[PDB]
Every structure is written in structure tokens, then in C-alpha cells.
């Protein structure tokens with residue numbers, strides 16, 4: 001799924017606890033042309049266009065999320081695994097109208113477990129930008145209006161081998177809102193060119 005030979009995403013979620021509520025969730029394949037989502041991130045040029053150019057291309061993914069905004073502590077939990085012992089640097093950049101408004105950098109050392117290495121980045125506090133954005137968003141009286149606002153909101157996650165600075169995974173995230181009857185959903189795509 002979302003991964004390479006060196007590093008795979010095992011689980012991703014963002015949630016609020018007052019039993020808890022997942023806005024989005026991935027627990028653990030088509031293609032999309034990165035071309036069409038440059039405007040959605042900064043031309044840093046450390047932004048998407050620049051990163052996809054250094055490579056490698058098989059490390060790049062796009063995820064479309066249909067978030068459940070129908071519901072505290074706001075948290076993000078991430079888990080990766082690999083067969084090699086590594087220390088990871090995880091960069092998350094929140095962008096609004098192609099401009100970066102948050103960058104969060106975290107480090108996680110491998111933990112030996114059941115014949116492989118796991119990397120657990122759990123219950124990291126969600127940035128306040130997002131908490132405040134979510135409280136506004138859930139106020140909109142129509143889902144079509146939430147989707148219009150979310151057209152301009154994206155996240156770019158870059159996971160690097162800290163000791164070698166090699167890119168392991170780069171994931172672009174885009175968002176719409178789901179209904180309550182249908183839960184959160186996602187679709188994972190390969191980014192190509």
C-alpha cells in the first residue's frame with residue numbers, strides 16, 4: 001500500500017477525545033500526475049515540485065481523505081515499520097492557498113518488535129492552527145461549503161532517514177468532508193509523471 005521496500009505506513013489517524021472520534025484513519029493501486037497539484041503546495045522549491053524532482057518517484061503518494069467532522073484532546077497518531085534499523089525525521093507541512101502555515105518536525109527511533117522495526121508517533125498534539133480550523137469548519141451549515149473551503153487546504157508529509165537524509169516517504173494529503181452515515185474514507189494513489 002502506502003510504502004516502499006524501506007519503509008511502510010502501518011497506521012495513521014487524527015482524532016479528538018473528550019472512546020474517541022476519528023476525523024480520518026488509515027490502518028494497514030491507481031496513479032495521479034503530480035503535475036496537477038503543484039499550485040496546492042509552495043514552490044519552495046523544497047515544496048512538492050522540488051522534492052519530486054530530487055526523487056525517487058516511487059516514494060511519493062497522494063491520499064484523498066473524506067473526513068468525518070460530525071462529533072477535548074486533539075491528537076495525531078502515526079505508525080511506520082521497516083526491516084532496517086533507522087531513525088526517522090517526520091516533517092508535516094500544512095498549507096493554505098499554496099502557502100505553508102505550519103511545519104511540524106518530529107523524530108522517532110526504531111523499536112524492535114516481532115522481527116521488524118516499528119516507529120510509533122502516538123498522540124502527538126494536533127497543531128492549534130488545525131484545531132481552530134476544525135472548530136470553524138464544523139460550523140459551516142453545508143457540506144458543499146466545507147468542501148469549498150477545503151479545496152485550499154493541504155498537507156505534505158515528508159519522512160526522511162535522519163542519519164542519511166535520504167527521502168523515504170513523501171505523502172500529499174487533500175480533503176473533503178463525508179457524511180455521518182458514511183464514515184471517514186480515504187483513497188491512496190501513486191504520484192507519477
Ligand SMILES: CCCCCCCCCCCCCCCC(=O)O
Nearest residue numbers: 014023067076092104126127130175
Ligand atoms: C479537514 C479534515 C482535517 C483534520 C485532520 C487532519 C489530519 C492530518 C494531520 C497531520 C499533519 C499535521 C501535523 C501533526 C499535528 C498537527 O496536526 O499539527
